[PDB]
Design a protein around this ligand. Structure first.
Ligand SMILES: OCCCCCCCCCCCCBr
Ligand SMILES: OCCCCCCCCCCCCBr
Ligand SMILES: OCCCCCCCCCCCCBr
Length: 100
């Protein structure tokens, strides 16, 4: 499994604060520096997409759905950029949008 050492991160505060959210977005989109957490996400995001979170902790799976639903509803443009870069064949795009 991926490490659980950052699993207590406060996702609600990241989603509530645009400056914070965009810092992570810029890290993963390679246009900004990465915090230790952001870096750990950037290094495992493609793998997780390729195997449907096979190595994710329960908290990470829960967290992913939370963040993805927020991006789809409130930052559609950021969702489009992320899904296109990290999921180019669209393995999960329609699935998450349908759930959202
Ligand atoms: O232990 C799980 C690590 C995840 C920490 C980073 C969460 C950042 C959520 C914001 C992402 C926005 C799109 Br990049
Ligand atoms: O279908 C799965 C795609 C959702 C993206 C999973 C995010 C990966 C979380 C891994 C945790 C990295 C440690 Br910070
Ligand atoms: O089509 C799939 C694209 C998935 C992009 C996911 C980015 C957000 C993942 C945040 C993970 C938080 C773990 Br706590």
């Amino acid at each position: 499994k991926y490490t659980d050492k950052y699993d207590n991160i406060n996702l609600d505060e990241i989603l509530a604060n645009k400056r914070l959210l965009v810092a992570y977005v810029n890290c993963v989109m390679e246009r900004g520096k990465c915090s230790p957490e952001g870096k750990e996400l950037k290094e495992h995001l493609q793998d997780a997409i390729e195997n449907g979170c096979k190595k994710c902790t329960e908290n990470q799976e829960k967290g992913a759905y939370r963040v993805i639903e927020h991006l789809i509803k409130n930052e559609i443009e950021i969702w489009r950029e992320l899904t296109a870069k990290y999921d180019p064949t669209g393995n999960w795009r329609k699935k998450y949008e349908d759930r959202a």
